[PDB]
Design an enzyme around this catalytic site. Sequence first.
Site, PDB file in Angstrom:
ATOM      1  N   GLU A  19       0.803  -1.215   0.000  1.00 30.84           N
ATOM      2  CA  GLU A  19       0.000   0.000   0.000  1.00 30.84           C
ATOM      3  C   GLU A  19       0.834   1.262   0.000  1.00 30.84           C
ATOM      4  O   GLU A  19       2.062   1.208  -0.030  1.00 30.84           O
ATOM      5  CB  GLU A  19      -0.909   0.009   1.243  1.00 30.84           C
ATOM      6  CG  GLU A  19      -2.372  -0.320   0.971  1.00 30.84           C
ATOM      7  CD  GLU A  19      -3.201   0.899   0.595  1.00 30.84           C
ATOM      8  OE1 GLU A  19      -2.643   1.896   0.086  1.00 30.84           O
ATOM      9  OE2 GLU A  19      -4.424   0.863   0.829  1.00 30.84           O
ATOM     10  N   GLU A  35       0.025  -5.333   6.324  1.00 28.33           N
ATOM     11  CA  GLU A  35      -0.341  -6.675   6.766  1.00 28.33           C
ATOM     12  C   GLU A  35       0.756  -7.597   7.280  1.00 28.33           C
ATOM     13  O   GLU A  35       0.505  -8.772   7.544  1.00 28.33           O
ATOM     14  CB  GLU A  35      -1.179  -7.363   5.692  1.00 28.33           C
ATOM     15  CG  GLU A  35      -2.525  -6.675   5.477  1.00 28.33           C
ATOM     16  CD  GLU A  35      -3.136  -6.970   4.123  1.00 28.33           C
ATOM     17  OE1 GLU A  35      -3.775  -6.052   3.552  1.00 28.33           O
ATOM     18  OE2 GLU A  35      -2.970  -8.108   3.623  1.00 28.33           O
ATOM     19  N   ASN A 118      -5.959   5.433   7.334  1.00 34.45           N
ATOM     20  CA  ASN A 118      -5.674   4.583   6.189  1.00 34.45           C
ATOM     21  C   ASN A 118      -4.934   5.269   5.043  1.00 34.45           C
ATOM     22  O   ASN A 118      -3.978   4.716   4.497  1.00 34.45           O
ATOM     23  CB  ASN A 118      -6.970   3.962   5.669  1.00 34.45           C
ATOM     24  CG  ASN A 118      -6.722   2.879   4.655  1.00 34.45           C
ATOM     25  OD1 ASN A 118      -6.509   3.159   3.479  1.00 34.45           O
ATOM     26  ND2 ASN A 118      -6.710   1.632   5.111  1.00 34.45           N
ATOM     27  N   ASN A 173     -11.622   5.360   2.753  1.00 35.05           N
ATOM     28  CA  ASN A 173     -10.356   4.811   2.294  1.00 35.05           C
ATOM     29  C   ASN A 173      -9.484   5.835   1.562  1.00 35.05           C
ATOM     30  O   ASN A 173      -8.786   6.625   2.191  1.00 35.05           O
ATOM     31  CB  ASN A 173     -10.658   3.607   1.396  1.00 35.05           C
ATOM     32  CG  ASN A 173      -9.560   2.574   1.418  1.00 35.05           C
ATOM     33  OD1 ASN A 173      -8.385   2.914   1.462  1.00 35.05           O
ATOM     34  ND2 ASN A 173      -9.940   1.300   1.393  1.00 35.05           N
ATOM     35  N   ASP A 227     -10.518   2.044  -3.389  1.00 33.39           N
ATOM     36  CA  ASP A 227      -9.443   2.017  -2.412  1.00 33.39           C
ATOM     37  C   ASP A 227      -8.622   3.300  -2.596  1.00 33.39           C
ATOM     38  O   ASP A 227      -9.070   4.366  -2.197  1.00 33.39           O
ATOM     39  CB  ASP A 227      -8.591   0.755  -2.597  1.00 33.39           C
ATOM     40  CG  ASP A 227      -7.724   0.443  -1.384  1.00 33.39           C
ATOM     41  OD1 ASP A 227      -7.335   1.376  -0.646  1.00 33.39           O
ATOM     42  OD2 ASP A 227      -7.427  -0.748  -1.167  1.00 33.39           O
ATOM     43  N   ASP A 230      -5.930   9.182  -7.070  1.00 31.27           N
ATOM     44  CA  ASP A 230      -5.052  10.293  -7.444  1.00 31.27           C
ATOM     45  C   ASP A 230      -5.566  10.941  -8.732  1.00 31.27           C
ATOM     46  O   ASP A 230      -6.207  10.284  -9.561  1.00 31.27           O
ATOM     47  CB  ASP A 230      -3.603   9.819  -7.668  1.00 31.27           C
ATOM     48  CG  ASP A 230      -2.734   9.944  -6.416  1.00 31.27           C
ATOM     49  OD1 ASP A 230      -2.864  10.944  -5.683  1.00 31.27           O
ATOM     50  OD2 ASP A 230      -1.909   9.041  -6.161  1.00 31.27           O
ATOM     51  N   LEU A 271      -2.361   3.612  -5.824  1.00 36.70           N
ATOM     52  CA  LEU A 271      -1.549   4.040  -6.951  1.00 36.70           C
ATOM     53  C   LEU A 271      -0.897   5.395  -6.723  1.00 36.70           C
ATOM     54  O   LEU A 271      -1.262   6.131  -5.799  1.00 36.70           O
ATOM     55  CB  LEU A 271      -2.402   4.046  -8.229  1.00 36.70           C
ATOM     56  CG  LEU A 271      -3.844   4.573  -8.175  1.00 36.70           C
ATOM     57  CD1 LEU A 271      -3.886   6.066  -7.971  1.00 36.70           C
ATOM     58  CD2 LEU A 271      -4.550   4.219  -9.476  1.00 36.70           C
ATOM     59  N   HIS A 272       0.081   5.713  -7.563  1.00 39.85           N
ATOM     60  CA  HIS A 272       0.796   6.977  -7.461  1.00 39.85           C
ATOM     61  C   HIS A 272       1.568   7.206  -8.745  1.00 39.85           C
ATOM     62  O   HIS A 272       2.161   6.277  -9.295  1.00 39.85           O
ATOM     63  CB  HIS A 272       1.786   6.925  -6.299  1.00 39.85           C
ATOM     64  CG  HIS A 272       1.990   8.242  -5.620  1.00 39.85           C
ATOM     65  ND1 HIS A 272       1.027   8.822  -4.823  1.00 39.85           N
ATOM     66  CD2 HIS A 272       3.059   9.073  -5.582  1.00 39.85           C
ATOM     67  CE1 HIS A 272       1.496   9.949  -4.320  1.00 39.85           C
ATOM     68  NE2 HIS A 272       2.726  10.124  -4.766  1.00 39.85           N
ATOM     69  N   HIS A 285      -3.375  -6.580  -4.156  1.00 42.85           N
ATOM     70  CA  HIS A 285      -3.407  -7.626  -3.143  1.00 42.85           C
ATOM     71  C   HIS A 285      -3.693  -9.055  -3.565  1.00 42.85           C
ATOM     72  O   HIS A 285      -3.879  -9.926  -2.714  1.00 42.85           O
ATOM     73  CB  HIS A 285      -4.319  -7.189  -1.998  1.00 42.85           C
ATOM     74  CG  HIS A 285      -3.924  -5.874  -1.403  1.00 42.85           C
ATOM     75  ND1 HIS A 285      -4.726  -5.172  -0.534  1.00 42.85           N
ATOM     76  CD2 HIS A 285      -2.794  -5.139  -1.547  1.00 42.85           C
ATOM     77  CE1 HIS A 285      -4.108  -4.067  -0.163  1.00 42.85           C
ATOM     78  NE2 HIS A 285      -2.934  -4.022  -0.765  1.00 42.85           N
TER      79      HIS A 285
END
Length: 312
Positions: A19, A35, A118, A173, A227, A230, A271-272, A285
């Site tokens: 993440e 996680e 988050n 989120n 989730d 951007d 994302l980014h 995931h």
Amino acid sequence: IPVIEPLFTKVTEDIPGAEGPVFDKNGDFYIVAPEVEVNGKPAGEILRIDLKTGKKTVICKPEVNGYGGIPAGCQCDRDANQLFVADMRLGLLVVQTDGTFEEIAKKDSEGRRMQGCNDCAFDYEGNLWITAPAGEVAPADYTRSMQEKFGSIYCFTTDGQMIQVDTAFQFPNGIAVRHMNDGRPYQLIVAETPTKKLWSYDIKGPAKIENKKVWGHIPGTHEGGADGMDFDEDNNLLVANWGSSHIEVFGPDGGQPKMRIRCPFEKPANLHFKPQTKTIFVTEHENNAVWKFEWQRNGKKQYCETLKFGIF
Ligand SMILES: [Ca+2]
Ligand SMILES: [Ca+2]
């Protein structure tokens, strides 16, 4: 709805719950592994990724008084090369490149116990908008708003105040801020995962949001939903639709996605964009890995790309 299938290239693998993809001021790439756990206990990690080799380096494994963190989202700072990290167990953290970190708040501006965060998004004024889908931060028992509406939204201001701006969300989120062409922040977008909704507010000022509205609708009846998110340079909002195998693309006015991006996996998480490029790094995931693909245009400049002393 038109769907494109760009080539996804493998970046790195085996990151439990990969993440918060983010780039700092020097162009270094980071990912968080929320996680990761030791003996059934949270032991989340913050990693630096060598983009040329894909090798992973854990720079920070946050823990406060024995309580391990669950780092899930990041934003790079502008005035200093440091990372602001939303932690599902620890709230908000400021992490230095050397791996040291500090816990920002145990309580909000109203003296209320802080909630686990988050994701977050810096506006051009330096204010940090944060989603808080978890319950109270450690040492409190871990809880999350996937079933009940106790998720909140916060705004960590330039003057160091952690202000709760809204509550009653079913797992807030992803989050993003829309700016006017002159740089003025005017709209906040918040993803509410299970309800398949994207909510918007008018940003009237630092920690000041009004007119809550159901801005967009996320496709599918699958478990999951919006989730990470951007904006691209044209203000199109790209949203990772966890469990749908697609990244949704919304136009400036929202509503229904105007385009979908098919991913070679079922669970895109966050994302980014890579600064100055059309490259979008995506964590997922299904395989717990990081990938990259080329979007149609460059990303909207993140706060860390803007200049405090810039004339234009
Ligand atoms: Ca997230
Ligand atoms: Ca991002």
